[PDB]
């Protein structure tokens, strides 16, 4: 791996791992303690558990990069790990979208919300998000195979590649962006209309979340489609092939960004940790 990108990607992987493991674990513990009293903790529980599951899988990818693209494992773990990783990613994205929609609904319609709010609805929404993630993942569940030269971990594709890429792009990027932007813009618009509810930290938090999500999840989503519409002739194919590790490392940033945003926006954190 004499390429400058590989070492930077490995360093980012390691840093993300040891930064995100403890925060995710602490958030999971606190919200699991508090989930028996408040409805507003289930969403954060789901985000924290999804992020912890995403982050725990980093060493496998790190050592796979280290072993120079060789599959040293058996023929059963080949079709197990990638599906789980994809499921965790889509679950995280959809849970963020549902949390934004929930905040929109709570702000605009308080009476109806307090009249119908309950744990069952939150659990139903979480289950819907998880099953949508699994349904999106199913192609990786099925078409994944393995091959031996050395061993290569690949997927058997025989139209299908482009179709999967288009579905992935649409249902993983277009809907979350629209939901996030529209819901948060309307929330700020209504909040800054009355002096009683007007505050300054809401704009900061919303803008930070939207900007970080956009920056960290556009380039990977577009380089995943660039590879699905080009022949292997152009050297730009080599230029984009030498960027996959960097793209994945930059995509992993949200998994650590989210717990920091959650912990730095609360009213009290040390008391909750001590009391649990």
């Amino acid at each position: 791996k004499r390429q400058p990108g590989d070492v930077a990607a490995l360093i980012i992987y390691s840093v993300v791992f040891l930064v995100g493991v403890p925060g995710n674990a602490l958030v999971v513990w606190v919200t699991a303690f508090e989930a028996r009293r408040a409805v507003n903790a289930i969403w954060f529980l789901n985000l924290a558990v999804a992020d912890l599951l995403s982050c725990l899988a980093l060493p496998v990818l790190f050592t796979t990069v280290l072993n120079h693209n060789y599959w040293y494992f058996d023929a059963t773990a080949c079709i197990v790990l990638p599906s789980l990783i994809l499921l965790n990613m889509y679950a995280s994205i959809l849970l963020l979208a549902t949390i934004s929609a929930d905040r929109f609904l709570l702000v605009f319609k308080p009476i109806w919300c307090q009249k119908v709010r309950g744990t069952g609805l939150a659990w139903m929404a979480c289950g819907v998000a998880w099953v949508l993630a699994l349904l999106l993942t199913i192609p990786s569940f099925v078409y994944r195979e393995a091959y031996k030269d050395h061993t290569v971990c690949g997927i058997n594709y025989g139209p299908k590649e482009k179709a999967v890429a288009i579905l992935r792009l649409m249902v993983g990027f277009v809907l979350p962006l629209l939901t996030l932007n529209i819901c948060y813009t309307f929330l700020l618009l209504r909040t800054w209309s009355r002096k009683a509810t007007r505050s300054t930290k809401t704009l900061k938090v919303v803008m930070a979340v939207v900007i970080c999500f956009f920056i960290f999840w556009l380039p990977y989503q577009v380089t995943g489609v660039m590879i699905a519409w080009l022949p292997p002739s152009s050297p730009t194919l080599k230029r984009v092939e030498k960027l996959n590790s960097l793209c994945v490392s930059l995509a992993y940033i949200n998994c650590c960004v989210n717990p920091i945003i959650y912990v730095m926006a609360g009213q009290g954190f040390h008391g909750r940790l001590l009391r649990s």
């Binding site: 990818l61 693209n69 790990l81 091959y147 997927i155 594709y157 996959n244 590790s245 994945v248 995509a251």
Partner: peptide
Amino acid sequence: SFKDMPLXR
């Protein structure tokens, strides 16, 4: 088939 995809994609 004979095609490569680094895991995560």
